[PDB]
């Protein structure tokens, strides 16, 4: 048995799934009804620009359409299903797709919107988002204090934490934490992801997604907002919204997967991110990231040779 | 004739270089020689943390040692040298040591320092850059007429060109783009590479270059500064350093190649970056990107011997 992850924001990258789409005729199903459904994605994701497909509004449903294709390339060639699923950000609708929660052109759809939504939702140089190393939680958490306009947005690994908010908030803080002997690097990104200012984003997308049917998903699929597994459908609808503007607790749905028994992590689509985030959390686990033939085969082979 | 190009910054990521590193003996060796000159590079470019990966002390070095390491893999496999060569601003340097001007070793410790130095070049926050896509160059210089500390970057493309300077200045022009009809992927904090603010990273890495031999490359190599091939290595050197504060002139390099009569473009180490910028920039031509045994497989089948 293993947890299916799903990557989100920062994994894509130009040529991602054509490989797939070229060894499996399940991916090539899925990614052709990606096509369908949003004209061009294809182009995007193949060959660029990689400034092109790094907007938002591109990357998100590039994304979804990849980590999908690659999970159904990897049960055509005889993986079973995961026990639990997850995915970080963006990366939960897809793991929804994947337990039958959403359809992929309804998905596909609203991502491209959320991603809309919410580069639209700041104006250009008023957002920032840094990643922050070698340190706890709760020293950062102690020196956000008092600080407006900052908080925490992603909790990746221990001592792998990212803060957004205001710039000039997130720079003050940067100050501190660096002070602090943390090692504070920006991200390449001009949205203050995960923070209350994304307010605006999620409000529309809850009108989008009014219009949307949600059925019970086919195995457990975690909450990026809650940490928790998630099956009622419309408590499914209610936190895909709030997951918006919460932070993104990976660590705890990782740690909370292992106590469920989870040892095997799988990330689908590109890139192997969450595969680093895996391992540099939960030591004993193994984590391999299915995004192309060989690594699909390698997964097949620890999953059932 | 096909000439090589080398990715730079924006190409890489977690997991870069792996798949070459185990499936070619020529790539493996190159990266572990990489790894004995920059003890942990290996950790950084497969497990991360992808934050510190991008850090351009380590995301330098770590795209150079790959864009080596394909080459070498597609030489030993009995692939053909290039007639011409070029890399993205730190590719530059990747395609000379390919070309044999200096050695990997040297490199590789010139260019650790070459991205510490751009990184505590201007102070954190008071940088930052954009990408401006769907605008040609004309209107892009317009709507910077007036404007004090921003610059134009790169030439990527027709119409994928990059600006930096001034925090505040870039944003304004930012919004002016936006206004233009024009789609930008801005970064509100980050050192404002390719400006002149960048000097004092040149004037640092001068002395550090100066105590490298340099020789006459096996096969001309392009100057981001000169658009034109260099091979007179007191030339190289001066050039190498001006740079660092010089515009890329990428779409120029491109046209002279196309001029020269390259039809074939081989983008080795990561990423297929390069590959769509030569897509979007020369439509007669044709572009493969060496960064795994598949590419590899290909990129001989049209240009072994």
């Known amino acids: 048995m293993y947890a299916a992850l799903f990557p989100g924001q ?3 990258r130009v040529g991602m799934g054509r490989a797939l789409y070229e060894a499996s005729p399940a991916a090539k199903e899925v990614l052709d009804r990606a096509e369908a459904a949003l004209p061009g994605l294809l182009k995007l994701m193949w060959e660029g620009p990689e400034e092109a497909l790094t907007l938002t509004e591109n990357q998100q449903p590039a994304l979804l359409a990849a980590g999908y294709a690659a999970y159904r390339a990897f049960l055509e060639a005889g993986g079973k299903p995961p026990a639990l699923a997850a995915g970080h950000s963006l990366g939960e609708w897809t793991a929804h797709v994947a337990a039958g929660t959403l359809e992929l052109e309804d998905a596909l759809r609203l991502v491209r919107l959320r991603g809309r939504y919410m580069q639209e939702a700041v104006p250009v140089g008023e957002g920032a988002m840094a990643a922050v190393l070698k340190l706890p939680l709760e020293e950062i958490q102690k020196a956000l204090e008092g600080l407006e306009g900052v ?3 992603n909790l990746n690994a221990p001592e792998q934490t990212v803060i957004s908010g205001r710039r000039q908030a997130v720079e003050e803080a940067a100050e501190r934490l660096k002070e602090r002997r943390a090692r504070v690097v920006f991200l390449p990104v001009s949205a203050p992801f995960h923070s209350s200012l994304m307010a605006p984003a999620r409000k529309r997308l809850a009108e989008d997604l009014a219009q949307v049917p949600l059925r019970r ?5 975690y909450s ?3 940490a928790r597994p998630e099956e009622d459908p419309e408590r499914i609808r209610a ?3 709030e997951q918006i503007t919460a932070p993104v607790r990976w660590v ?3 740690r909370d997967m292992e106590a469920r028994g989870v040892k095997r992590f799988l990330e689908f689509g590109s ?4 595969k680093g985030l895996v391992l540099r ?6 984590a391999l990231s299915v995004q192309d033939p060989d690594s699909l085969r390698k997964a097949l082979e620890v999953e059932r040779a």
Chains 1, 2 share one sequence.
Do not use: D, M, Q, Y
């Open 239 to 241: 936190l895909l919204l």
């Open 252 to 254: 705890e749905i990782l």
């Open 281 to 286: 959390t939960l030591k004993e686990a193994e």
């Open 224 to 226: 990026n907002v809650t």
């Open 217 to 221: 998903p086919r195995f457990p699929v």
């Open 271 to 274: 890139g192997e991110v969450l």
């Open 10 to 12: 920062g994994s894509h």
């Open 151 to 153: 908080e925490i947005a």
